[PDB]
């Protein structure tokens, strides 16, 4: 080679040179001689450029074997893998972490593993809208919110300058889940006969206390002292005390009669156990509730109710039976924004306006 590559050539075309006096020359593919082009860099370069043609796609470099290299190598998936680790340090509540991973695993499968800076806003909306037409409107909202936050952390660690995800719109999604009525409750009550015994007790205990399903299968008989049921929620983590002196006159159920009905029939360390004297998962108590739903032969608009709806119906009755300030503390709520949203009907039964 004789000269090989040099340092000045690193920024100069193939048929171009650069003398010692900062001058440039124009090689000749006939004898090897050269002439005088210019004094400037980009000028002499562009000249040799227009001579034959431009560079190419990337860089040549083709000696005999290989050598050291330190170029660019940006990637989205690579960042995502580092993002999942940063999340585990934000102090999460187990389950919530899984939710994120479920949204991240969908992005890497719907978006190329190319550099972040190369990721335009278009290719982000192309995938997003691809899940909006399938009815998964709620999914598109969580995917864009999780993906957008992934870039905010990227910018903080010197990777990108701007977030091309905060430019796209978020798909709004209205709740399609219907509400449960008192006249519908008894219907399911009678359809649960073919079902185990704990299903007829867990339904009455989830409407008299208005407690969450998850915090309903975690209450031991030791959490009941002097007639008070100390319940510590897992979601918000708000502790409360439900007195045994509470009964619904809209269904004919007492909390002191239902509680003792779970000590003989069920019998276990937990108020709501199974047929094996053992605790029961929260993702199964609702399952056996859906069976009686479809078996009872009902008919609703859109998505049918669920076990969680027992908490809504409980508060709906606890607002007319006693007062509003009562069905606001029993549920564990404190804010005054959802006290009006958890009171809605969504279009089930017309809000009968009396003289008052």
């Amino acid at each position: 080679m004789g000269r090989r590559r040099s340092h000045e050539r690193r920024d100069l075309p193939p048929n171009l040179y650069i003398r010692n006096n900062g001058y440039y020359c124009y090689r000749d593919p006939r004898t090897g001689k050269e002439f005088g082009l210019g004094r400037d860099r980009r000028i002499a370069i562009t000249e040799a450029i227009q001579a034959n043609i431009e560079l190419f796609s990337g860089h040549k470099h083709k000696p005999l074997t290989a050598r050291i290299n330190s170029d660019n190598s940006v990637t989205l998936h690579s960042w995502l893998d580092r993002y999942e680790k940063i999340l585990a340090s934000r102090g999460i509540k187990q389950k919530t972490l899984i939710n994120y991973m479920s949204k991240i695993k969908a992005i890497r499968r719907g978006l190329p593993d190319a550099p972040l800076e190369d990721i335009t806003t278009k290719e982000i909306a192309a995938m997003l809208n691809g899940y909006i037409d399938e009815g998964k409107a709620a999914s598109a909202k969580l995917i864009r919110s999780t993906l957008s936050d992934a870039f905010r952390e990227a910018i903080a660690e010197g990777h990108i300058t701007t977030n091309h995800v905060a430019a796209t719109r978020a798909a709004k999604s209205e709740v399609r889940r219907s509400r449960l009525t008192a006249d519908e409750y008894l219907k399911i009550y009678q359809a649960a006969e073919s079902s185990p015994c704990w299903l007829r007790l867990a339904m009455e205990l989830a409407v008299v206390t208005g407690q969450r399903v998850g915090d309903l299968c975690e209450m031991k008989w030791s959490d009941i002292v002097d007639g008070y049921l100390y319940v510590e929620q897992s979601k918000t983590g708000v502790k409360i005390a439900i007195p045994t002196a509470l009964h619904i006159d809209a269904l004919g159920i007492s909390m002191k009669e239902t509680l003792d009905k779970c000590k003989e029939i069920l019998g276990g360390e937990t108020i709501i156990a199974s047929t094996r004297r053992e605790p029961l998962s929260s993702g199964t108590v609702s399952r056996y509730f859906m069976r009686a739903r479809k078996a009872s032969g009902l008919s609703f608009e859109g998505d049918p109710p669920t076990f969680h709806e027992l908490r809504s119906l409980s508060a709906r009755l606890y607002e007319k039976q006693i007062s509003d300030k009562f069905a606001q503390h029993l549920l564990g709520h404190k804010s005054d924004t959802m006290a009006s949203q958890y009171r809605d009907d969504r279009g089930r039964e017309w809000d009968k306006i009396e003289i008052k």
Partner: protein
């Protein structure tokens, strides 16, 4: 903060005549360029003789 014409050329490797150095001033052959005080030029301590072409 600045350096006179003589105090700048005296630090050079090949101290040329005063006239020649004064010519590299009018020909902007010195960057950063020197400023004229009253009768003399006060270059920068980092000012170098940029020889182009």
């Amino acid at each position: 903060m600045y350096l006179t014409l003589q105090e700048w050329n005296a630090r050079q490797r090949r101290p040329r005549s005063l006239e020649t150095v004064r010519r590299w001033v009018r020909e902007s052959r010195i960057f950063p360029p020197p400023v004229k005080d009253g009768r003399e030029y006060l270059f920068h301590e980092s000012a170098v003789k940029v020889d182009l072409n």
